Amino acid sequence: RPTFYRQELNKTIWEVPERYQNLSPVGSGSVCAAFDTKTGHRVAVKKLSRPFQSIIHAKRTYRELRLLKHMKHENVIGLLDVFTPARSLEEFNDVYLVTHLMGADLNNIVKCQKLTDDHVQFLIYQILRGLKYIHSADIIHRDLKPSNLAVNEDCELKILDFGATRWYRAPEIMLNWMHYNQTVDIWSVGCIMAELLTGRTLFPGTDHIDQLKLILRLVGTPGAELLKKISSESARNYIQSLAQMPKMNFANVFIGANPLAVDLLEKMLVLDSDKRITAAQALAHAYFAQYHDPDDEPVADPYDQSFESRDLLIDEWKSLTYDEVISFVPPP
Ligand SMILES: CC(C)(C)c1cc(C(=O)N2CCS(=O)(=O)CC2)c(NC(=O)Nc2cccc3ccccc23)s1
């Protein structure tokens, strides 16, 4: 067991191993940058807030640990370390998770460099490659957006989740359809790609309904084939009253863009989620001919997420979170 040390960081206690110095807040879980003396690298440390306060907090805490322990891919956040000050299960009340510090998010990059077409290819390709891996574990991100995409000085990207969001959300999420296929994430990627291409937010909705109004103006009112799949009588009736709207020609909208990028966008920003390109399909799209390697887009090991259907006691979730902390093996 390492030896710990306590720190005050803006009204929060932080109790971390001595391995980790120069803690400097970044995020509020809350997150600090720190320097890892055992590798010499900069890290981000997340302290979970109140991990075990309710059954739902308890289950969420276990959820994040299991997910992060499973994610082993270049374009997805991975765990360098996980620790607790606790010497025993009875002591156990905080969880800390450790990852390689990436020093910027894609929001930062977007607001002060106009990306070239090659940049857009490389960045969207890596998002799709991480997303191929995430989706192959039967996980849905559900909140993909620039601020959830960490980028380094070589333009290498990792997908993560800090926990407006609405600007990149699939319109089925905002109408609470409740099924959601993985292509909700592909909607998000199309909003991100549009913005890397134009430098402008594609759908800067003011609020919830404005969001949906902006979406329908680009992609048009649901077509016959879509309206036909809507089982809720009420959802339906409303929509044919909703102005009606031509789907816009995207080639017109993204004027000077690579026509392969335009084509990819048309295949991601489809209203009907059954008709949106998948991440593995998008990787094979000709826009990414310079980056695609079919032997280097790996998928995840099976991920047991049967815990998701379970309704357990606080102490049960807590004990399970404790087992995962103990069983953790750091990467090489
Ligand atoms: C889907 C995907 C992309 C693999 C992730 C899910 C969660 C997750 O379970 N929750 C649970 C639900 S929730 O908190 O709303 C969203 C997050 C991650 N957590 C995560 O990225 N944590 C971290 C974020 C930022 C800095 C970190 C630094 C060190 C370690 C982890 C960090 S990443």
Ligand SMILES: CCCCCCCCO[C@@H]1O[C@H](CO)[C@@H](O)[C@H](O)[C@H]1O
């Ligand atoms: C206000 C704009 C209307 C939004 C229409 C979005 C329809 C989403 O797409 C739907 O997603 C479901 C998965 O959740 C699938 O079961 C449906 O078959 C698919 O058509």
